[PDB]
């Protein structure tokens, strides 16, 4: 009784695809972000925004297609279809890069939608909402990289473009201009990601190799029952093994699994903080002591100064085509180059 | 090199000389460690989410598990019940053995491919090269993001080991 | 002298590096894939100049 | 004065000490280069 309660009833039915209140936000926005990416990478160019072909229609492959960012001249325009730039024209809207903000924004709200889904399903099933909490790290990364970072720069143009090779370009740009590998926040990020993979691997392997024999099959997968009360592998034997191999070992299963949440989630959050810094070009670019010494002493060389040379190469050789709005013309004679190459 | 910045040097020169980012084995490697991190967090959070209540609010939930206890410490049916609704019922693992095997296999295989990526680019079978792959009706090159990547790689190439090359091709 | 061109690269803390810039530097390009144990060097000084530590490690 | 009923004892077990010290020391090992710059 009461349309609100009837609606709630319907939204929360246990169907094949749970909808929920959260679904009202999630499904349209996720569908539009995915659909936008497929439409753009299949049919849409980047000629007028980047001087790039970017679709299957133009001859790109899966690795090279992208939905590219708008031209730098658009600033941080929302670039709404009915906005002052496209003025309701769908074709021009595509040509001006409207699909990029379409996808970034519908995607952001879709991520909000999904995390809300995690909360709603957790609440309905009666478990603690740690999955949502963990999803905060993907959120932080998306928001810092696709929204905050370009908002700090001149325009959406320098946001990552939605494509495989485009993303690779984003990586190389961050090396060349930001010296991003030197940034301790990126490093913590890397430690969290690789450490996460390490934990995934080692935990999986450990459980699979300390299994109790709970059946006669040589394929041991059948010897498990979801409702069984007993642990399917030996924590005691696992603990002894790792204690003797590595010196230390988990002894608490609850702590083990919390730690598996903590490591990659914390890593991604730290990387997000670094990117927020880079939005402002607030880089970990140099070590001043290094530079003072090297400037005064032409025989002093480290891997740090070598990498700066590489960066200078990247900037000079990539900027004219990567930043066409600057109209860079770098005569041959000013290009930095080592001997012969 | 056995050092942090030296490691980055190695990576950048590697990219110049092999276009490793466009190599499918390095891509599988990335899928392996991104995926590994994802599934790490996912598993951690699900098991954590389904811990059976054994403690009060003023103590750590971890005291709810005792080392060597025979009973499983979380509700795998609840965990699965959440996960299947989050996606659809069948993407989920209800079988802990299959699930843990997946957790082992995804990063291990992905990283195997990363290793093989480095190990075969060792013999200069390099990443995909789509430099100037798109051409218009007249014959003008239409750049793709692959060509921008090429501009960056060129920067790395011409600057690295700036005093070491006397001849125009870097053949090792 | 990592690249074998008498252009020695400093890797250690005492010689001007911090934790991020420091390294044990790969053996010389003049050595190539030749086995370079300590006893192949005329001296520890030679050994160090050519990146012997890297190979040993 | 009446004793406050909201008080609670605090704990840090040895393993948490080792984890925490590892975290601090490794963070310092990481950030110190940037502190000296």
């Amino acid at each position: 009784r009461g349309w609100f309660d009837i609606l709630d009833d319907w939204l929360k039915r246990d169907r094949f695809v749970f909808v929920g209140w959260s679904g009202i936000l999630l499904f349209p926005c996720a569908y539009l972000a995915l659909g936008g990416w497929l439409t753009g990478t299949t049919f849409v160019t980047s000629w007028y925004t980047h001087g790039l072909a970017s679709s299957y229609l133009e001859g790109c492959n899966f690795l090279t297609v992208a939905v590219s960012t708008p031209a730098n001249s658009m600033g941080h325009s929302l670039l709404l279809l009915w906005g002052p730039e496209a003025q309701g024209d769908f074709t021009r809207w595509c040509q001006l890069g409207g699909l990029w903000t379409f996808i970034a924004l519908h995607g952001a709200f879709g991520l909000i939608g999904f995390m809300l889904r995690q909360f709603e399903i957790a609440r309905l099933v009666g478990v603690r909402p740690y999955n949502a909490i963990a999803f905060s790290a993907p959120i932080a990364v998306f928001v810092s990289v696709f929204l905050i970072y370009p908002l700090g720069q001149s325009s959406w143009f320098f946001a990552p473009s939605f494509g495989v090779a485009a993303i690779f370009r984003f990586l190389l740009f961050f090396q060349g201009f930001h010296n991003w590998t030197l940034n301790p926040f990126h490093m913590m990020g890397v430690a969290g990601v690789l450490g996460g993979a390490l934990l995934c691997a080692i935990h999986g392997a450990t459980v699979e190799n300390t299994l109790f024999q709970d059946g006669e099959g040589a394929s041991t997968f059948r010897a498990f029952n979801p409702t069984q009360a007993e642990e399917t592998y030996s924590m005691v034997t696992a603990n002894r093994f790792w204690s003797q191999i590595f010196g230390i070992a988990f002894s608490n299963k609850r702590w083990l699994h919390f730690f598996m949440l903590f490591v990659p989630v914390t890593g991604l959050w730290m990387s997000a903080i670094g990117v927020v810094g880079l939005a402002l070009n607030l880089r970990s670019y140099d070590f001043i002591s290094q530079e003072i010494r090297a400037a005064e002493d032409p025989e002093f060389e480290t891997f740090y100064t070598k990498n700066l040379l590489l960066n200078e190469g990247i900037r000079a050789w990539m900027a004219p085509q990567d930043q066409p709005h600057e109209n860079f013309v770098f005569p041959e004679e000013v290009l930095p180059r080592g001997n012969a190459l | 090199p056995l050092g942090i910045s030296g490691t980055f040097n190695f990576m950048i020169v590697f990219q110049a000389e092999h276009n490793i980012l466009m190599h499918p084995f390095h891509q599988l490697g990335v899928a392996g460690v991104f995926g590994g991190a994802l599934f790490c967090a996912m598993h951690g959070s699900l098991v954590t989410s389904s811990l059976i209540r054994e403690t009060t609010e003023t103590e750590s939930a971890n005291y709810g598990y005792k080392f060597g206890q025979e009973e499983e410490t979380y509700n795998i049916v609840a965990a699965h019940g959440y996960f299947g609704r989050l996606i659809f019922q069948y993407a989920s693992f209800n079988n802990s053995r299959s699930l843990h095997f997946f957790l082992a296999a995804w990063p291990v295989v992905g990283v195997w491919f990363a290793a093989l990526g480095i190990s075969t680019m060792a013999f200069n079978l390099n990443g995909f090269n789509f430099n100037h792959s798109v051409i218009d009706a007249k014959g003008n090159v239409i750049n793709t993001w692959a060509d921008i990547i090429n501009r960056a790689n060129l920067g790395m190439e011409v600057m690295h080991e700036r005093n070491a090359h006397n001849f125009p091709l870097d053949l090792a | 002298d990592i690249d074998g061109i008498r252009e020695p690269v400093s890797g250690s803390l005492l010689y001007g590096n911090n934790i991020i810039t420091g390294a044990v530097v790969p053996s010389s390009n003049a050595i190539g894939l030749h086995f370079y144990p300590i006893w192949e060097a005329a001296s520890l000084d030679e050994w160090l100049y050519n990146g012997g530590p890297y190979q040993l490690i | 004065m009446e004793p406050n009923p909201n008080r609670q004892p605090v704990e840090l077990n040895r393993t948490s000490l080792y984890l925490g010290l590892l975290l601090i020391l490794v963070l310092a090992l990481l950030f110190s280069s940037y502190f000296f710059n």
């Binding site: - | - | 803390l13 | 077990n13 393993t15 080792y18």
Partner: peptide, 30 residues
């Protein structure tokens, strides 16, 4: 003093490895 600092922190970490391994709280079965 920079070098001394780096080496000091590293040394403390190794010491910690020693204690965390040989002077851990022993796991006990219930």
């Amino acid at each position: 003093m920079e070098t001394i600092t780096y080496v000091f922190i590293f040394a403390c970490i190794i010491a910690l490895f020693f204690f965390a391994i040989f002077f851990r709280e022993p796991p006990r079965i219930t």
